[PDB]
Every structure is written in structure tokens, then in C-alpha cells.
């Protein structure tokens, strides 16, 4: 196909030699889902600005307002290094010698009487 032969070149440019045949079919299904939610929001933004033609600033708005919600990322390095030094300053606690099975408080564990219904 046309758009399915370009999908095998996006993977081969990323060095993916081996892949399942259903991999191309659902990246096209995601790419179709992504463009019919940019352009669906683009004509919502065009009707907000009251213009009959969806021009390039509408797609510039609908991309950056969908990328502000959908595609997130891990926390940044200046945020990870601040919560590290706030946590790594606290000294390590000592251990009680014969406390038993060392566990968190019981509202943080998964050890409850764990009931079930009576069969009748």
C-alpha cells in the first residue's frame, strides 16, 4: 500500500529490522487517530475565530493544545535533583533488632483478613 510502505521506512530508519506484521497496521491506526483529532479540534478552533477556511494557524493551535495534554514526559532533571537532595539529607534510621517481619504500617501493606462471600 501507499501509506503502509512509508511506515516500513519509518521503522527501518529507526533501525527496527524485525517486527510483527500487525505493527504497521496499528501505527497507521494511531496516525489516523491522531490526525482526525487534530483536524477535528482545528475546525472547532476555526469556528471560535469565525473563519470558513481552516488555515495553518488553526492546526498550529490544535497541535500545541493537544501536545499539552496527550504526550507527557518524565520529570525534568532540575526537578529530580531537587527532590533528591531534599530526600537524601535525611539520615538513615536505625533498625529494631527483633521486630519480626519488617513491614510498613498495616494501612500501607496488603495484609488484611481478605473476606469472601458465603456460598449458599
Amino acid at each position: 500500500p501507499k501509506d503502509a510502505q512509508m511506515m516500513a521506512q519509518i521503522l527501518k530508519d529507526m533501525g527496527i529490522t524485525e517486527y510483527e506484521p500487525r505493527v504497521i497496521n496499528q501505527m497507521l491506526e494511531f496516525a489516523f487517530r491522531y490526525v482526525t483529532t487534530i483536524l477535528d479540534d482545528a475546525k472547532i478552533y476555526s469556528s471560535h475565530a469565525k473563519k470558513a477556511t481552516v488555515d495553518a494557524d488553526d492546526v498550529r493551535l490544535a497541535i500545541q493544545c493537544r501536545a499539552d495534554q496527550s504526550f507527557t514526559s518524565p520529570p525534568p532533571r532540575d526537578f529530580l535533583l531537587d527532590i533528591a537532595r531534599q530526600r537524601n539529607q535525611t539520615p538513615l534510621p536505625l533498625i529494631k533488632p527483633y521486630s519480626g517481619p519488617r513491614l510498613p504500617p498495616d494501612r500501607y501493606c496488603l495484609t488484611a483478613p481478605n473476606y469472601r462471600l458465603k456460598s449458599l
Binding site: 472547532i44 475565530a49 495534554q69
Partner: protein, 76 residues
Amino acid sequence: NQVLTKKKLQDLVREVDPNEQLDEDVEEMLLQIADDFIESVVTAACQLARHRKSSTLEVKDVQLHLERQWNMWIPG
């Protein structure tokens, strides 16, 4: 500078349950979530308003960001 006065938030809990008490950590996180919501909503609404070539920030702009990104549908 604080927009939520920490006592009207306790009336938001009393209306749901007359017998419920939040923790101080929970209240502070709820206040942070509110502050973050106000900031994100206003920034995107302002992006829609610049898009409509306006300096006015009318509700149409705030109402559109709720319906498309948050699905709130507040009556205007």
C-alpha cells in the same frame, strides 16, 4: 494572593458528606491542584483569545478550553 481560603474548601466537603474531615496534607494538595487548574485553564484560554485576535479574554474562550480538554460543560 491565595484565591481559595481553606474554609470554603471545607464547605465543599460538608455539602458532600456532613461527617468527613480531610487531613492538612490533603487540603494543601487540593489547594495546589486548584491553583494549577486556574493557571492551565487561563493560559490556554488566553492562547484561544490571541488566536481570535482579541485582548479581552471573554468566557467563550474559557468555556471552549473546558469542553475540549477537561469535558466540564459548565453552564455559561
